[PDB]
Structure 1
């Protein structure tokens, strides 16, 4: 558990993949709230971010091609 955008306001996007990799595993599965410790509001804001990298070939759906 650490700090989030609850006080430090930030508009979330999908480009900062380093921020995305903290919440996705190597197989490319979205990490649930019980491990992120995040509010689901920002997680759903990040869930749409995951599909953008998934669809635009920045991230894979299945890690084995």
Structure 2
């Protein structure tokens, strides 16, 4: 598969408000993807985790979703 950072632009990892780009780090469910799927660095993923959780509290990113399969 492709990795998220690979197919993307130059973005602000600290901006909790940019949903169009943060939605690209969630799964089909609301889960935050592992580094093996985001292609981020140790320091970056730690920062992404916090910024997505920030967006979740503003109602911009979901906490959990429903899987349409199985």
TM-score (normalizing by structure 2) = 0.67
Q: Which runs of 5+ in 2 are unaligned?
A: none
Any idea what SS the aligned residue of 1:22 has? helix
Query: Deviating runs (4+, > 2 A) in structure 1?
Result: 1-4
TM-score (normalizing by structure 1) = 0.71
Question: How many residues align structurally?
Answer: 61
After superposition, the CA RMSD in angstroms is 2.5
Identify the structure with bigger relative contact order (alpha carbons < 8 Å, sequence gap 6+): 2
62 and 12 in structure 1: CA distance in 2 versus 1, 3 angstrom threshold: same
